[PDB]
From a paper:
Substrates converted by this enzyme family typically contain a guanidine moiety, which is hydrolysed to release urea. In 2021, a Ni-containing guanidinase, mediating the direct hydrolysis of free guanidine to urea (which is further converted by urease to ammonia and CO2) and ammonia, was described in a Synechocystis strain.
PCC6803 (GdmH). Crystal structure analyses of the heterologously expressed N. inopinata guanidinase (resolution of 1.58 Å) revealed that it exhibits the same α-β-α fold of the arginase subfamily as its cyanobacterial homologue, but with each subunit containing one nickel and one manganese ion with the overall structure being highly similar to the Synechocystis enzyme with an root mean squared deviation of 0.74 Å over an aligned length of 361 Cα atoms. However, the N. inopinata guanidinase possesses an N-terminal extension, which is lacking in the cyanobacterial enzyme. This extension stabilizes the tertiary and quaternary structure of the guanidinase through extensive interactions, consistent with its notably high thermostability and activity in a wide pH range. On the other hand, in comparison to the cyanobacterial enzyme, the N. inopinata guanidinase lacks a C-terminal extension. The tilted Trp313 in N. inopinata guanidinase permits access to the active site from the surface, in contrast to Trp305 of the cyanobacterial enzyme, which blocks it.
Numbering used by the authors:
A (entry chain A), B (entry chain E), C (entry chain C), D (entry chain B): 4 to 377
E (entry chain D): 5 to 377
The structure:
């Protein structure tokens, strides 16, 4: 795994992860930092004469200040002409929709809330030893034009937009929006695999595998419909964290018949997260190369993700699920990801949007350092 | 314990709890589900012609939609004539009172907040393998007419109402309301045990065993006065989670003199929750058959139960206390239960009321699956 | 002055303002609407086949949906190269700073909160009869790189940035940020008036005219230092709304010595808003052509602007101050404006940022319809 | 009437209130300010060498900074020895109790919330022309030891403490706490009037004149029992603002039988606030020696006082009730006052506690400038 | 800390509970009785209908918890700061957020901590300590901070903290942003007579870069503190570093200066008892005086939502409280600061509650282990 390598001499009082991290930082380049500084001084003017740090412009035009600037995800460039998204390693897009919600709405603002709090972050992860600014190009293409009155029209919009981004070669990060969108995203991706199969790593307390809910393909039905697609095999759908009082019986039945794999929170913690991640990877990637990551923020215990429509006690703790994701994203390439169910109206201190931002950034960083992205 | 039995063939990549759960669901009946659907169409009219799912009425009458309907606890039937409560296996009642609180008030709304968020839940628990709708009859008899200006009059009201419900043969679930009510609930139950003894399983960070507080029998005093009752032995009062800066010295002294049993959070986690539950059960049931469960939401770490009047860091984590409760409620029958100190005005995303709802449902489900109820 | 003209025949049951408004709408062009629709489809792809309204792209690119898209002020174009701001009639810029606040901080997020809620608005005002999309070009140049640890360095940044925008010819709209910044904005503008004089229309409960506060030139001091500038005469500083318990005595004294004009809330409502506006305009523009509008959201009664660091009861009601602003902005050209003290952390449902947005838009609309802008 | 006097020359562009205010400030002394500065430097040490303002200590001791310091009401000295309260013109005391509430609790924190936000204020009112620091001595004696579980014991405590303060000669300002306490405060005052009679100016949407409520003397009953006291005549109870859906019929009946006077909000606004105040004063002071001011924050429209247990639409607007109170407190001496029903748990922006603080300071300032206090 | 057999107890108690129940039975009540007597004198005896004759008319001590003027745990306010040396412990606030690089609001940290601190009694069950009986605590209020000038604020904070530390009282500084750590350590170091000062720093952020937005903000305190001659960077132990907000220039400067860093995962995997041993060994190596700098952000965001720079993956409460207890039991501390609590982002006050708990547990362990009082 990731340990101190002896390339940069360091004293022995460091913890093991810290020692890896401090050395790793010393070996990272600064080229893209220098470019952003130079661009900011050109576009935002040199700072006033009383500013001692001559890297500081008059107008904010990069990372700093964190509390300033137009809110794109982690202050990535806004790509207005979406046909250019293939020029970037990673494309963030939003799917602001909550017509698939069976309890609270509000996740239509998921994309806005995630973008907003993502400004708090720098470009660099200490323990992962990655500086995204130096190692990958990220853009934000904004939001799908969703259709609140009609979930089927919304699916069509999301499949087309996500399919466009996936076909361009950029790694799509979809900010939801409720979990019904997982059907539309997977449907768009599967349309561009040339018949190859797509597995799914699904983090959620909810099984999301029933046919209809309140007479529509709501957030409780995405994987029933997705695994009806010929090149999306249900045997490669791995459902991580199922439990509680909101996994509906019709969804459990359909998943049994289709032979999805389920691992409860207790299953994963009792076996060890490292073992749980190995088992999930082996199933999801069995006989398939492309795997989609679908992360519902509700798989965390409610106290860590209060801003969601279907909160549940007894979920994962952050260090558990972040380790799980890091192992996944270090070990295998991913076709893309979506993070769904963040509902800012129920998230007063933005800690749910914060968690979602963290999940995205850890996944991207691990994809990068393990050679799967960039 | 609860493991896969081989009655329903299943592949080998399920986690152990998930494998048990998927099999268990396949063996559950659907009779009560079908009855509710049929009744809903009768009471709420057939749905409009454009509705494809003909199980859907015009007016919501039953579980769905979760965001709709009159808010009884888990949408159980309201039993206006409280003399009929004996017709049900379980009777939910509220005790909306906060005149016993020594810091923040607000738990007068505990019953309303618990009932409100209870709608989010289905009738079925995945990992416990139980569908309450199929296995037990539950009613909601509303609230005790509490007396905010007079804690003693409130006690008399609560003892009379709880005593009535307990004497009817229904399993009482009391929604608090502050912990002073634990005296009144136990006093009413003990009146109907034909002289038999009553033990108490008390989950809380606070001992609640002093004589008076601010000159009255407030939430720090219930078990001092409960264990003065001749058939309520203090040696069978087991206090789980005691710790922090709010266990008052006079309560500690009185509990010592009466020989109550205390296990701190750290005690329980270090020994192992399974071992802690075994020890608690042995002490509480030693020479008594009837045991009352008194659950203070404050026994959870503050972050999981922000909506309480006396929050404390360093409490249980949800998976710890839920396992504790599951073992208790699987191993022994309970005389009844109360869940106290939920204060919605300090609970923005309703995660405290959500925790309380989950505690009730897990306890009921374990009582049912283990043959103690329904 | 704005009444039905008889150019568009209308029935007689309309109210007078409605009759003006309905006729005015019928006379507005749609050219820029059509251009934005066409551009959106080009940049955002045609909508999916199931979408009937073929004006809808796959990706949101323009006004719709209001809940979608990157949050620039009223979804104006982000102008990354601030050297291009002179190409627009109006340039929005933020000054995210709260080192000048003497009670609550949080107005560093004022620009972000105003931009966010501004998406709720369309481009057209019913009762003012103005469609900004058709009549004026607006851009958003982002934020000044403020210096939270040093108010003087922040002033220097703000004066340089605002001076640049004002010098370019664009009408600057400065989103604050606390009222200390009033000094730095006026200082920047006055540097570019060719020695001509600058009056100030100041809406606030607070006089903001003392020398220092907590040893620095904080939000209680901006007009003391602004009127020390040779071409900023204190006799043309009109202070509208002063009152309550937070107008410090040293500020009252200095304003008296310098002969600023003050009208309290009660003065204005007692005389009539129309008369109050006449008096304020008469004084501010006496012997000067250029006047700066400095609007503190705290001049509204606290209930309308809870998200501010220095709230006060007894302020203006919205219809009173909006009428005041409309008369000002119809009657005379303005050199620019700033809206300060919006503090989103204290603004739960964003009604303070909503008020700020409304003030900007009414002022711009009145400048446009009266031939002072665009 | 308070008008410009021509004692301090001023230009003619000032509004009438502003002209009176600017002159009035120029005539106020600074003696007590200078004493506070000197005391602060002694007790808080001189500030660091880099501080230019040599009035600034190292430790905050006095008014500034407003965001700093121990929260007494408007940072008045805490008088720990309550036997010394007679040494002050005005004594603030809290009654933290909400056992008399018939809907929401939370007003037990009224005193704390009012004290907290009161730090925002200076010592001087612009439009009233009063500097409390220079003209009256104010102390804060903390809180009555209330008895949450027993409203009658709470009444006895409140009567004893308020009686003590009133008998000492200090003007009592009682921070509530629910309106049940109005009985206990008036009972304590009446005990020390030596047979002289007491009128009551009662601001509220609720009559608060029934016998019992939920079997106790709750906030709907204070004036039924107060006017049973021989020297508290019901004909001198003037009830200002009654209306809505929470004025109970038994209270209306009892007030009718006892011939209290009621003026609704619409009555007062339609007749004119100046005329309403004259009528209320006439009735309250008719044939009595002293009048008690009982102000329920609920008499304001809910939007201005969201933090209360019994909010109602259609109440007073701030400028209406502040004028009403100013006329009362300028025209007649008052025996004391209570401000009740502020409930901080429902007051997220603190604007309710702000309104309460403003009411107190306006009443005090008018008592002082009109020769009734100090 | 185990049951000692001094007070006979039955065998069904958990081990910590058994220690606790015995320990309470051995605590005195002298200072309790003095507080009761003082309250009746100063607040009057209660009304005749009150049966408990310890209850005054006016609240004047611990009770009721929801009542009274909010000093830290209702300790006496010491208006004359020249008298702070009469107390074992002196609480002071530093209400400043001009060092914050994202959210402000921590200027109210001191007010929010004082407010929620009223909920506590004077006694800890599992630590077996009654602070009212064993240590004298005062609250001297707040430093007069300077919101528009971070450097002037540092000078005020160094002068006030230095005064309190020089008086002999144990200073507890309520922040305020972590920029203030430079100023507090600077003030303490002036008064060590050349003696060296180590630092135990609980945080997700290294806080070791030179400037940030052109000033010495909350990301820079330890760069400038370890430039002080008697503040060795080798004795700066940084516990909890991780996430996406540990800036690269801070990591570089700490590497060059040879600070020690142990991530949350490092501590949890090695065991908190082992992590505390290692941290104490490094911090106290060749130094007697060690300062405790606790950023509330070292806890997972969900436990400390009221902060300007929250981060997932932090410590859980029982982990960090054990860590702190071992530190504060094993070694004396020169003082402590608790920083970054931002009440405007703390709706149910759970962040200020955590901060209060950290302070009380540290003080209680210092007392019971003979380092204070
Ligand atoms: Mn889910
Ligand atoms: Mn009322
Ligand atoms: Mn930190
Ligand atoms: Ni889901
Ligand atoms: Ni309890
Ligand atoms: Ni202002
Ligand atoms: Ni009332
Ligand atoms: Ni820090």
């Amino acid at each position: 795994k990731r340990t101190y390598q002896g390339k940069v001499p360091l004293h022995d009082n460091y913890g093991p992860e810290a020692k890896y991290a401090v050395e790793a930082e010393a070996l990272l380049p600064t080229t893209k930092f220098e470019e952003e500084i130079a661009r900011g001084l050109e576009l935002g003017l040199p700072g006033a004469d009383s500013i001692k740090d001559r890297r500081i412009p008059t107008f904010s035009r990069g990372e700093l200040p964190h509390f300033a600037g137009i809110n794109t995800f982690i202050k990535a460039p806004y790509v207005e002409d979406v046909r250019k998204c293939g020029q970037y390693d990673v494309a963030i897009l939003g799917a602001p929709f909550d017509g698939g919600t069976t309890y609270r709405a509000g996740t239509r603002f998921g994309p806005q809330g995630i973008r907003k709090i993502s400004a708090l972050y720098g470009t660099y992860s200490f323990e992962l030893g990655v500086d995204l600014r130096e190692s990958v190009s990220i853009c934000d293409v904004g939001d799908i034009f969703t259709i609140p009155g009609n979930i089927e029209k919304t699916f069509d919009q999301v499949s087309k937009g996500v399919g466009h981004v996936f076909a361009s070669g950029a790694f799509p990060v979809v900010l939801g929006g409720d979990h019904s969108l997982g059907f539309a995203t997977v449907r768009g991706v599967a349309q561009h695999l040339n018949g190859k199969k797509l597995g799914i790593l699904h983090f959620d307390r909810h099984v999301d595998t029933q046919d209809t809910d309140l007479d529509e393909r709501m957030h409780t039905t995405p994987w029933f419909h997705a695994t009806n697609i010929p090149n999306v095999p249900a045997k490669n759908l791995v459902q991580i964290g199922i439990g509680g009082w909101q996994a509906p019986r019709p969804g459990v039945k359909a998943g049994r018949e289709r032979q999805t794999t389920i691992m409860t929170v207790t299953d994963c913690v009792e076996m060890g997260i490292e073992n749980a991640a190995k088992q999930a990877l082996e199933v999801a990637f069995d006989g398939v190369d492309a795997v989609w990551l679908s992360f519902d923020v509700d798989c965390l215990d409610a106290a860590f993700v209060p801003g969601t429509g279907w909160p549940e006690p007894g979920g994962f703790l952050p260090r558990e699920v972040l380790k799980f994701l890091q192992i996944i994203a270090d070990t295998k390439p991913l076709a893309g990801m979506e993070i769904v169910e963040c509902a800012p109206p129920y998230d007063a201190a933005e800690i749910t949007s914060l968690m979602a931002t963290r999940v995205i950034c850890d996944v991207l960083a691990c994809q990068v350092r393990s050679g799967h992205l960039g």
